[PDB]
Design a protein around this ligand. Sequence first.
Ligand SMILES: CC(=O)Nc1ccccc1C(=O)O
Ligand SMILES: [K+]
Ligand SMILES: [K+]
Ligand SMILES: [K+]
Length: 272
Amino acid sequence: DTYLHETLVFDNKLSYIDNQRDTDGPAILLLPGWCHDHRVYKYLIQELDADFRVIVPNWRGHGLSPSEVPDFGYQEQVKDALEILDQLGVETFLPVSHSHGGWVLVELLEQAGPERAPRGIIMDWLMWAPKPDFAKSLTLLKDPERWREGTHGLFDVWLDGHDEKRVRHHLLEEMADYGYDCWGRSGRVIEDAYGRNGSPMQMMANLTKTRPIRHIFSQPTEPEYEKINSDFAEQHPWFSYAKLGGPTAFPAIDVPDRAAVHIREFATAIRQ
Ligand SMILES: CC(=O)Nc1ccccc1C(=O)O
Ligand SMILES: [K+]
Ligand SMILES: [K+]
Ligand SMILES: [K+]
């Protein structure tokens, strides 16, 4: 796409979207999850393109040409993300994560500090620790034998019974070139992130400087998930949530207009 660039980040060539929009801060930093790239954000980029600078970093061995790379985790994702922003001369940015991109976003808030990264939006990120099926998925992903079966179970959960053409295209075509090197790693990093931090919510409550964060999600759809968000929201003045009511675990693809309005509201609030 017309905004895709490549640059050496430390000892690694990384692709990134940068629309290089000459405009008032903050920059909007869209953070992919594991084993997909900027392609997940092509519709959200269209929504924001005119009014904001939009950067989408790809992770090591992520992008149009996936590749085996040495082991890394979310701490390196943060460093990779900041180096691209430093190279681009970006100061203030509003990070927005998809799913387990959320580990990068929260660590980026701690490392960048509340001046550089005053707020955050986490999209469709499992707020509780894995329930048995998701734990079984991560186990399958780490298995050199059963990793594809791992991704197949996840694709079933993410689509949640929906013939969602754009999301199916993302999973079965735009992720098709990712292999066991990425998927095994994702499974190790997510497993370890939960083990170490306990949960997304524990990690966010544990920031030195708490800041406005909104969780915008469509999945899971059960009332009991809406409750752990409502209970966390009552406990933490800085945490809010919106249920977007989209079909899939990919609101950036299937309700981009809705993702955009929340990102805009947080951007507008930083500009004041
Ligand atoms: C593309 C994507 O959502 N990444 C994942 C890969 C493995 C396990 C979980 C996820 C996730 O972030 O939901
Ligand atoms: K449909
Ligand atoms: K609140
Ligand atoms: K959705």
